[PDB]
């Protein structure tokens, strides 16, 4: 009921009714676990399916484990934290749908942040919100540029190995902002470059490009 910091699960829950969550939380604390202060401090994400919530899409880049709530129920039953293996989230439908293995995503996340050394400019009208995209980009190691980059900035990033790659993200409602960029032959991608990219831990410069 009281463990060392490196032995304490820091848990996020996603996709549950408020009352279920209340109950899971009581159980968690009795066991000496805690609710995570944020994705970045989370060790375990509890989810019963692959679900594209902000929690899932930030957590996936940092957590050690994505498990079903059955894990926590068995832990509480045994009054100890048991091994995660038998409770790893396996969503056959989502995996076929998005052509990935969640296990493979976690492995890649641990090796390296998907957006290591990448800067994103994201137009203001984006959906989900700019704040959401930003939190997802950052957990994955990227940075979001607050100012729209000039043609000069874009070229200079490309010409210097010492400078991060810049990636532009937009949506239908904002494409008028990018007209001059397209004329220049600059790529702009839709939000899925980030959303689906982080879920599957892949960079896909072709599926989501407006060009």
């Amino acid at each position: 009921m009281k463990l060392t910091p490196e032995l304490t699960p820091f848990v996020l829950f996603t996709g549950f009714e408020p009352v279920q969550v209340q109950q899971y939380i009581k159980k968690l604390y009795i066991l000496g676990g805690e609710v995570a202060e944020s994705a970045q401090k989370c060790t375990h994400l509890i989810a019963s399916k692959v679900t594209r919530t902000v929690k899932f899409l930030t957590a996936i880049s940092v957590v050690k484990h994505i498990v079903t709530p059955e894990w926590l129920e068995e832990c509480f039953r045994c009054q100890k934290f048991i091994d995660e293996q038998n409770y790893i989230l396996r969503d056959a439908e989502a995996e076929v749908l998005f052509s990935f293995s969640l296990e493979e995503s976690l492995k890649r996340a641990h090796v390296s942040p998907l957006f290591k050394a990448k800067y994103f400019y994201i137009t203001p009208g984006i959906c989900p919100s700019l704040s959401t995209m930003k939190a997802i980009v950052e957990c994955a190691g990227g940075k979001v540029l607050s100012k729209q980059p000039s043609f000069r900035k874009l070229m200079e990033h490309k010409q210097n190995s010492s400078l991060s790659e810049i990636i532009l993200i937009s949506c239908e409602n904002d494409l008028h902002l990018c007209r001059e960029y397209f004329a220049r032959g600059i790529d702009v991608h839709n939000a899925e470059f980030v959303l689906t990219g982080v879920l599957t831990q892949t960079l896909d410069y072709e599926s989501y490009k407006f060009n």
Binding site: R52, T53, V54, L57
Partner: peptide
Amino acid sequence: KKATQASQEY
């Protein structure tokens, strides 16, 4: 839709 607490999927 009625407002709810549910976490939105994207």
